Amino acid sequence: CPHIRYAFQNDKLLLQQASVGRLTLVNKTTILLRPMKTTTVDLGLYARPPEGHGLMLWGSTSRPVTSHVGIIDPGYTGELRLILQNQRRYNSTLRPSELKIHLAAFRYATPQMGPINPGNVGLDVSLPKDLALFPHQTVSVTLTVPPPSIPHHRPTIFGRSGLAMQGILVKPCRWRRGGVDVSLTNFSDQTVFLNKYRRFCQLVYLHKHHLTSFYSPHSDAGVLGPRSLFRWASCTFEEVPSLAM
Numbered sequence: 684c685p686h687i688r689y690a691f692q693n694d695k696l697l698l699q700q701a702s703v704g705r706l707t708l709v710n711k712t713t714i715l716l717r718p719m720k721t722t723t724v725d726l727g728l729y730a731r732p733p734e735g736h737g738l739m740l741w742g743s744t745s746r747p748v749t750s751h752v753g754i755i756d757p758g759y760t761g762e763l764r765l766i767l768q769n770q771r772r773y774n775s776t777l778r779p780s781e782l783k784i785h786l787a788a789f790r791y792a793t794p795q796m797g798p799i800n801p802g803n804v805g806l807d808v809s810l811p812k813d814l815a816l817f818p819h820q821t822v823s824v825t826l827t828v829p830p831p832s833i834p835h836h837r838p839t840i841f842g843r844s845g846l847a848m849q850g851i852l853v854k855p856c857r858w859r860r861g862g863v864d865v866s867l868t869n870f871s872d873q874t875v876f877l878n879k880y881r882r883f884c885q886l887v888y889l890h891k892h893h894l895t896s897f898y899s900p901h902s903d904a905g906v907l908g909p910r911s912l913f914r915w916a917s918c919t920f921e922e923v924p925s926l927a928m
């Protein structure tokens with residue numbers, strides 16, 4: 684893996700380290716999460732993945748907060764943001780050091796082809812039926828028609844940022860042979876009506892090397908869960924201050 688070029692400037696976050704292909708930031712200040720609303724963290728972070736790679740952005744905390752897992756497209760030169768949701772019906776705070784923010788790369792592949800719909804990592808997946816997502820509840824839907832097989836890669840499902848901003852998170856998961864149950868959780872106070880054919884998540888083909896059952900400083904259960912640990916590419920971070928905007 685060639686360098687991940689990056690820039691970082693934000694006095695409210697600490698760069699903890701950039702090690703074995705993962706950069707980790709921590710919050711220096713208290714972050715307040717209102718209930719029933721999105722909290723976004725403007726990271727002051729910019730990054731460009733080497734050829735053949737995308738970037739994965741995720742948050743980790745033991746507090747009752749759920750973060751969107753962000754798929755970062757290779758041509759994206761804007762600022763990175765972390766999108767957070769409050770699990771509780773009261774204010775939740777992340778005191779300094781309670782939030783870790785991780786960025787790391789991965790190889791991905793793209794099929795040439797609803798239900799599965801310019802350089803983006805993920806292909807949009809459409810809703811097979813209308814769903815009403817009531818406030819503070821989860822709704823699940825099954826995708827059974829298998830996506831194209833790509834040698835040495837594994838299909839996986841992630842959310843998109845647009846729905847995350849409206850309080851709707853997708854739990855990322857592997858799309859195995861036999862089908863996948865996709866769970867959408869509404870962290871808002873508003874019932875959201877998603878209609879048939881609406882894009883609701885994205886299919887991403889990770890190189891098989893990026894899923895492992897082994898725990899180490901090279902993998903993390905925070906992305907797709909504890910069965911399918913995410914093992915990022917072993918790239919080097921290279922600071923390029925000019926990238927900051």
Ligand SMILES: O=c1ccn([C@H]2C[C@H](O)[C@@H](COP(=O)(O)O)O2)c(=O)[nH]1
Pocket residue numbers: 740751752753754755756757759762763764765766842843844845
């Ligand atoms: O958590 C995220 C997810 C995405 N992005 C940026 C990088 C992506 O290329 C772009 C669009 O993301 P989606 O709408 O496809 O999620 O926004 C973020 O800053 N944070």
